[PDB]
Design a protein around this ligand. Sequence first.
Ligand SMILES: [Zn+2]
Ligand SMILES: [Zn+2]
Ligand SMILES: [Zn+2]
Length: 117
Amino acid sequence: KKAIVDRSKAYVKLKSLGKEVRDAGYVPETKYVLHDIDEEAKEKALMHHSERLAIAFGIINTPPGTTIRVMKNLRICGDCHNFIKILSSIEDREIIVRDNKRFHHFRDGNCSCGDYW
Ligand SMILES: [Zn+2]
Ligand SMILES: [Zn+2]
Ligand SMILES: [Zn+2]
């Protein structure tokens, strides 16, 4: 209930981050979203990938510059990998996403996996 409030705050930050990461050169690859829905809804479906929501929550919940550490039991999709790389170029935080195979260390617009995962 109050946890729904934490989610709400993450979705709000995500919208903000979405605009800035777009300004930084992120272009959402919506050809991936296999639903008979409009382009805006497809872009929202990608923005709402849970690793983005968890990163947005980490950013509002921690002091500026704090390393963000997110764990996802599933592989990070190509679109999230691009989004988080670009976010790491404009947010002065190390962002670490642990997926099913590795620790993706996003720093300064690069990932430690070299985009091969
Ligand atoms: Zn889907
Ligand atoms: Zn994704
Ligand atoms: Zn990576």
